[PDB]
Short mmCIF file of C-alpha atoms and ligand atoms in Angstrom, two decimals:
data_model
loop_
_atom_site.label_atom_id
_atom_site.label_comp_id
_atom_site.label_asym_id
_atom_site.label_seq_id
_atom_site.Cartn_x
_atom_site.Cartn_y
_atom_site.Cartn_z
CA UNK A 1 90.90 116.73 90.15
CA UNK A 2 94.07 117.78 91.91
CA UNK A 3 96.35 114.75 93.16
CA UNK A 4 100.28 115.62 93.35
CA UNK A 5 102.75 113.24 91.30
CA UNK A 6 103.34 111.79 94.74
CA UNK A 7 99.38 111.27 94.92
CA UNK A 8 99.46 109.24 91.74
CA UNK A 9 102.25 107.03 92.07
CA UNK A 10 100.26 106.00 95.50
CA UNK A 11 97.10 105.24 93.64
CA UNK A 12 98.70 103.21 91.46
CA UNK A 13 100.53 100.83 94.34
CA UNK A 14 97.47 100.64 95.38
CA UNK A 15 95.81 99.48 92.04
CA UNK A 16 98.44 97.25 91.93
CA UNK A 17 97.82 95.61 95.99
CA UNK A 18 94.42 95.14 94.40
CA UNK A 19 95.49 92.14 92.04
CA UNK A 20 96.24 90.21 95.59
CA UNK A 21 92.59 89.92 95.86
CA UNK A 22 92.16 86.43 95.35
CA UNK A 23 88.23 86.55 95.02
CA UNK A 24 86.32 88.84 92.26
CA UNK A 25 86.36 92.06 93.81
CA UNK A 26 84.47 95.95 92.58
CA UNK A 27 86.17 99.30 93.73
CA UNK A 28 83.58 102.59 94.08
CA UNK A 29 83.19 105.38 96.10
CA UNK A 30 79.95 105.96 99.13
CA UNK A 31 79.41 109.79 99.65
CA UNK A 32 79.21 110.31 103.15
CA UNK A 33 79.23 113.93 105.25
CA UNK A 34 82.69 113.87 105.64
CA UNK A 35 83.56 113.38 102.10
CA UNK A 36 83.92 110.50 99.62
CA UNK A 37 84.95 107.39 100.96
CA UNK A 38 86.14 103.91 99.21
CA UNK A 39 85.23 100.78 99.49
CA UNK A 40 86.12 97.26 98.20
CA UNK A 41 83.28 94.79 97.88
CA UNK A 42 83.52 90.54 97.54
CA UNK A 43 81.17 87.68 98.30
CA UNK A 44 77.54 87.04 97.16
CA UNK A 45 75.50 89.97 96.73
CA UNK A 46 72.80 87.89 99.16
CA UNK A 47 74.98 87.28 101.97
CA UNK A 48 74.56 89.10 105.09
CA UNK A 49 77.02 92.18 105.32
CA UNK A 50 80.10 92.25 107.01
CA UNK A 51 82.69 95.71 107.50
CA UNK A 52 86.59 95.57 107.43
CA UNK A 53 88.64 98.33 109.02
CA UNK A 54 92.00 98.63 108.14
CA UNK A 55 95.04 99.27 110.21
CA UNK A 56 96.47 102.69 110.23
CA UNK A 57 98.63 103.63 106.89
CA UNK A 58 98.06 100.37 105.46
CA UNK A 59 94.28 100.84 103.51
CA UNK A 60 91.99 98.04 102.90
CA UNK A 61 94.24 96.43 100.47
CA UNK A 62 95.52 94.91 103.13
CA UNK A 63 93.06 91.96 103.34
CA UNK A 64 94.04 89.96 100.70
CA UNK A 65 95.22 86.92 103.18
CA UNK A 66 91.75 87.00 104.63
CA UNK A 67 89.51 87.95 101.88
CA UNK A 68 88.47 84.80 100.15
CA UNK A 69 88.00 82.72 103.12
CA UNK A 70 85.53 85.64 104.99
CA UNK A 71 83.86 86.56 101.33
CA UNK A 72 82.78 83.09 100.79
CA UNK A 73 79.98 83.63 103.39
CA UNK A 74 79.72 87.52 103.71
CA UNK A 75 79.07 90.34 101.39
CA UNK A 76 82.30 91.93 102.68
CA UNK A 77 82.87 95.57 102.40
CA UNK A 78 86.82 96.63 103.03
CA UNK A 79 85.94 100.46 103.63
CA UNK A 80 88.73 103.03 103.84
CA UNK A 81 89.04 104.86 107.20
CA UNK A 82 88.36 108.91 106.09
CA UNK A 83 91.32 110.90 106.68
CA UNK A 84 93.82 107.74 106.49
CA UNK A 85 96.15 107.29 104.23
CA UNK A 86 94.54 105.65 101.91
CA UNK A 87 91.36 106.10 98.77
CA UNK A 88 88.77 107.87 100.60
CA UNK A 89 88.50 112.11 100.33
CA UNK A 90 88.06 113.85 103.47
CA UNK A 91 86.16 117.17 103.38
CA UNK A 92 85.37 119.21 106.62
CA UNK A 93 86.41 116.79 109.04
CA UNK A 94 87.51 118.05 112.46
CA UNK A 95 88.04 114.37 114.05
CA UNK A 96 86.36 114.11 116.86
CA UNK A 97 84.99 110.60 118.12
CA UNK A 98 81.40 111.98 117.27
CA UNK A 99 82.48 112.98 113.72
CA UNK A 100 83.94 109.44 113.26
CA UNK A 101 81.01 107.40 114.09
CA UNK A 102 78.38 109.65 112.06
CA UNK A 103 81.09 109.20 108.88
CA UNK A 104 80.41 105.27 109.55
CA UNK A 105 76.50 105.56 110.08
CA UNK A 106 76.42 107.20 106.50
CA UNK A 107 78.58 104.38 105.13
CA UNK A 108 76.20 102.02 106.66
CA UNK A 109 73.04 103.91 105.43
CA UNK A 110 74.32 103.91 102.25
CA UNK A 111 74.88 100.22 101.66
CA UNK A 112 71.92 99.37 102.58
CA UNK A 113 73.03 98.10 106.00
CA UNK A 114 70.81 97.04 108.58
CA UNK A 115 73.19 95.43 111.53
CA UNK A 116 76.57 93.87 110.50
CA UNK A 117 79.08 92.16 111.60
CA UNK A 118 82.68 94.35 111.80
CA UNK A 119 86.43 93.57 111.54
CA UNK A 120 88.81 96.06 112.14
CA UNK A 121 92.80 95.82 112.62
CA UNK A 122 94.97 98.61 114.26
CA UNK A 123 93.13 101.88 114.17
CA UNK A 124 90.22 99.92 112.24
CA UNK A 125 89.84 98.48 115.66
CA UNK A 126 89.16 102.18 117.65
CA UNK A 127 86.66 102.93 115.31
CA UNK A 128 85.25 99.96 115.58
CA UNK A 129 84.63 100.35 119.50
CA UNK A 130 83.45 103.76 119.23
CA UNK A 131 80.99 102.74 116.70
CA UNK A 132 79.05 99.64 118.60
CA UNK A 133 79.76 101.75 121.76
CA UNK A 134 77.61 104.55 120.08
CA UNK A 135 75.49 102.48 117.98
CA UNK A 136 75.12 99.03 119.32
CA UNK A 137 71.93 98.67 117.14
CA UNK A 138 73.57 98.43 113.75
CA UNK A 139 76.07 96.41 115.08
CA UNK A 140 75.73 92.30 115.31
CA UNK A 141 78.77 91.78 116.42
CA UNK A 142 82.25 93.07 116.33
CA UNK A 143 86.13 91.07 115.92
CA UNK A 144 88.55 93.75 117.24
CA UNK A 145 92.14 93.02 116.33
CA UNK A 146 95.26 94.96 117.58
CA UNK A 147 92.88 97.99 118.05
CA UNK A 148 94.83 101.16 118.33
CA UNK A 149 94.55 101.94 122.16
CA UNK A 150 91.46 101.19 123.20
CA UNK A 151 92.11 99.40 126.29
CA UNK A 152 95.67 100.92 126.72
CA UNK A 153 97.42 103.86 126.05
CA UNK A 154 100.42 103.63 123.29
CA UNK A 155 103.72 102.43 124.18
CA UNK A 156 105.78 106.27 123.41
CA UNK A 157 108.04 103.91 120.86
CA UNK A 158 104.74 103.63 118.80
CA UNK A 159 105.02 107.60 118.55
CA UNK A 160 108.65 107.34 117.62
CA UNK A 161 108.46 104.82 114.85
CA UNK A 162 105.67 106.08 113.52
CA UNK A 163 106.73 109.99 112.91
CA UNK A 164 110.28 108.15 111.96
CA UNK A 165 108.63 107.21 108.55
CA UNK A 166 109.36 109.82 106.69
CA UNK A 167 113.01 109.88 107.66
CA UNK A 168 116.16 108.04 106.25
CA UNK A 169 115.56 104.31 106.52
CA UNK A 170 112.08 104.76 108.76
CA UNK A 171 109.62 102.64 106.69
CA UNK A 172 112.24 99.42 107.19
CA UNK A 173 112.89 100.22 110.74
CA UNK A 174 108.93 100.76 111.64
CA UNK A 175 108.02 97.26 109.90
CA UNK A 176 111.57 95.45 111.14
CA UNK A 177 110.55 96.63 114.66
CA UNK A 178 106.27 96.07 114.31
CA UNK A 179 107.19 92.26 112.45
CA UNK A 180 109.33 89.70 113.72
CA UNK A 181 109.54 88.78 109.86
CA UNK A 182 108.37 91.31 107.60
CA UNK A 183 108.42 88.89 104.80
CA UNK A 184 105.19 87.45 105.58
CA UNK A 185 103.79 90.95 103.90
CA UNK A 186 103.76 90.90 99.92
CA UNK A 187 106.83 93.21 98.13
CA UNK A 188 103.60 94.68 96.37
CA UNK A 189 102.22 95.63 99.48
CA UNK A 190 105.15 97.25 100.92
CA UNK A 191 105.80 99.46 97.46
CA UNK A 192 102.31 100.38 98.42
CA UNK A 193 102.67 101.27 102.47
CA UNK A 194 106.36 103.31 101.09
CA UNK A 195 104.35 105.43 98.60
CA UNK A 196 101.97 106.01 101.12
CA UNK A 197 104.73 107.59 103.50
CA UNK A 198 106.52 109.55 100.37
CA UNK A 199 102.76 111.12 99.61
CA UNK A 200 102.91 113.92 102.46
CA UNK A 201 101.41 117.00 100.03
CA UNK A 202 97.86 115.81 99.85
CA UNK A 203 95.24 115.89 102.58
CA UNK A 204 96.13 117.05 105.97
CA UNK A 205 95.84 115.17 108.89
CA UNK A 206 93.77 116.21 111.80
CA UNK A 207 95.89 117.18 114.96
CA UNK A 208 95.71 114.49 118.12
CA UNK A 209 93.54 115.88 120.11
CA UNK A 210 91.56 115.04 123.05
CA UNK A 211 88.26 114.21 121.79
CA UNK A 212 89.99 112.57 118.72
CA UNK A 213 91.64 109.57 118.34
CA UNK A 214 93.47 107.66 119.31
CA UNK A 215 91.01 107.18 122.58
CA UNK A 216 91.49 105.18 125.33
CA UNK A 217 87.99 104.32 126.54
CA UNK A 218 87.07 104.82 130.40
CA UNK A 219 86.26 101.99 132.79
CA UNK A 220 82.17 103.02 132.58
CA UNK A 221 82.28 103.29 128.81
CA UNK A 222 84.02 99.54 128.76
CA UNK A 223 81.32 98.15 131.01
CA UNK A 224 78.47 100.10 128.97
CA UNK A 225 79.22 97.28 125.53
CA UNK A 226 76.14 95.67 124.57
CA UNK A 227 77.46 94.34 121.43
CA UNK A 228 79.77 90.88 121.48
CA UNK A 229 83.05 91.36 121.11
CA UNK A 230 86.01 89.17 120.07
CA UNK A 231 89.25 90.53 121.26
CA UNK A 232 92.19 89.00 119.16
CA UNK A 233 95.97 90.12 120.10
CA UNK A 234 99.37 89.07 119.45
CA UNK A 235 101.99 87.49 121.60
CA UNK A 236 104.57 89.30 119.87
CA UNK A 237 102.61 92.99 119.82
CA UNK A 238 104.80 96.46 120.58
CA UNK A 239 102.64 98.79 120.83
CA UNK A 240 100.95 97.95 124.12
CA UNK A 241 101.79 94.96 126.16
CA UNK A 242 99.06 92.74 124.70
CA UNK A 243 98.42 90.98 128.17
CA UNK A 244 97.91 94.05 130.19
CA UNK A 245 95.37 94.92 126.97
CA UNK A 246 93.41 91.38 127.47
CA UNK A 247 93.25 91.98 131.33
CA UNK A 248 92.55 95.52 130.90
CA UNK A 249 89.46 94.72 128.28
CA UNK A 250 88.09 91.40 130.17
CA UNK A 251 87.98 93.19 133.40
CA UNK A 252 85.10 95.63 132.16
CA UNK A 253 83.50 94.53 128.55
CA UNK A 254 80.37 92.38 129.81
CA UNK A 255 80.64 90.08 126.36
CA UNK A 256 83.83 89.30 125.16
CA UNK A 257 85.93 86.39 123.87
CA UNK A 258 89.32 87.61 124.01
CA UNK A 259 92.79 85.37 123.07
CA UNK A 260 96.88 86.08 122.94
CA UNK A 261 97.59 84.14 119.82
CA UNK A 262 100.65 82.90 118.90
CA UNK A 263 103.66 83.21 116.70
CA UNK A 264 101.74 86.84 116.31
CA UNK A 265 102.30 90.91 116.89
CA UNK A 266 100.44 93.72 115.72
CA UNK A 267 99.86 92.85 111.95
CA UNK A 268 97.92 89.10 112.90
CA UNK A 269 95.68 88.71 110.27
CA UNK A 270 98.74 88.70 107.97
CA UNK A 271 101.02 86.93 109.67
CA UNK A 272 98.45 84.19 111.20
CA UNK A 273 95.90 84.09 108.61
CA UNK A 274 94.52 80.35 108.62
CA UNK A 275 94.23 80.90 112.05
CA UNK A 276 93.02 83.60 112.30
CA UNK A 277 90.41 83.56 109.24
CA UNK A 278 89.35 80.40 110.94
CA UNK A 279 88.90 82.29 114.95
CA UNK A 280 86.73 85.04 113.14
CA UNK A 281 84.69 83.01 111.37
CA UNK A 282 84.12 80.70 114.22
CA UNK A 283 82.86 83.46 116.63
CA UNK A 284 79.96 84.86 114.00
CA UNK A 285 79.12 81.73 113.41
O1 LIG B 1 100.01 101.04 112.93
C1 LIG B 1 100.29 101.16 111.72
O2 LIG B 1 100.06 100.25 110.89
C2 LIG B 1 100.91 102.45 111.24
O3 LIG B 1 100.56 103.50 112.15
C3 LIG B 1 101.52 104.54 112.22
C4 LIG B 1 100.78 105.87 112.33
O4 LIG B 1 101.51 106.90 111.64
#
């Protein structure tokens, strides 16, 4: 082992986000090509699989609001993104789009999984397009919420806010500025997210680069989904105007339900989560 003090204060936050879990829960770690990776696991053993992708910085402790009511009829795996900030171990990992996708295929292969259905937030939502882009076979279908560019390119204040974390007051600015009322997120939560920012010493992140991510996919690549897609954004969203995103994504994706919800930004499945626990379960259904 080697994890900083700053490494270990953030694992424990995050053992401590963990008792949100409303629904019996097991923690363990998938070895993949790119290193080990953790995931969260809920629902009967029987049911058929379904993948959550957490938003960027936050890990996949951040589905507590949405965890019982999706585990009741999935065996649902809350897998954390390699590289993130977050429980999984990157090793070799370069970035790219391709390395991404083949990091999620092993994940797949080694629980077993056939096709599944997929829910991912934020840049839990990229991934998730390049995957059924790339692999449309493994995926049944896919709920893409807030997805980090994808359809458009960042507004430059997401840039700012985001590298503004580590500074002064950044973590309360970022969330003040992303959440019309941050108080909808649990105080255990946020000690998490804030040790998250403070650990800086442990593994470094991959430079944005062109055939990295964040991605915003071409017109021909949007047209080429063969998987369904549900396309959930938020009225109140900042980092892209979220109406410019819905045109931008019905214009081109040949199956896709997509919706500006209300009384909702970036962070919806935490700050609209009996409707929005409700919308996802209603499309695989
Ligand atoms: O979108 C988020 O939840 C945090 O992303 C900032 C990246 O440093």
């Amino acid at each position: 082992p080697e994890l900083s003090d700053n490494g270990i204060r953030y694992y424990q936050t995050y053992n401590e986000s963990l008792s949100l879990w409303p629904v019996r829960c097991k923690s363990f770690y998938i070895s993949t090509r790119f290193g080990q990776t953790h995931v969260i696991a809920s629902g009967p053993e029987d049911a058929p699989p379904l993948v959550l992708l957490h938003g960027a910085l936050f890990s996949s402790t951040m589905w507590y609001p949405n965890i019982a009511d999706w585990s009741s009829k999935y065996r649902t795996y809350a897998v954390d993104i390699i590289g993130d900030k977050n429980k999984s171990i990157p090793e070799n990992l370069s970035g790219t789009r391709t390395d991404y996708a083949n990091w999620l295929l092993d994940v797949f292969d080694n629980l077993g999984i056939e096709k599944s259905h997929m829910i991912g937030l934020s840049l839990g939502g990229l991934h998730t397009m390049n995957f059924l882009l790339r692999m449309p076979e493994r995926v049944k279908s896919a709920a893409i919420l807030s997805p980090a560019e994808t359809f458009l390119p960042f507004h430059h204040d997401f840039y700012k806010y985001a590298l503004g974390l580590t500074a002064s007051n950044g973590v309360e600015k970022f969330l003040n500025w992303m959440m019309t009322d941050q108080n909808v997120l649990h105080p255990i939560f946020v000690k998490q997210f804030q040790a998250g920012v403070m650990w800086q010493d442990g593994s470094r992140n991959p430079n944005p680069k062109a055939d990295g991510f964040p991605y915003v996919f071409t017109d021909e690549e949007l047209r080429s989904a063969r998987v369904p897609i549900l396309l959930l954004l938020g009225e109140h969203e900042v980092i892209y105007d979220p109406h410019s995103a819905l045109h931008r994504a019905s214009s081109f994706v040949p199956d896709i339900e997509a919706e500006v919800i209300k009384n909702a930004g970036h962070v919806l499945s935490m700050e609209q989560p009996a409707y929005v626990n409700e919308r996802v379960m209603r499309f695989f259904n």
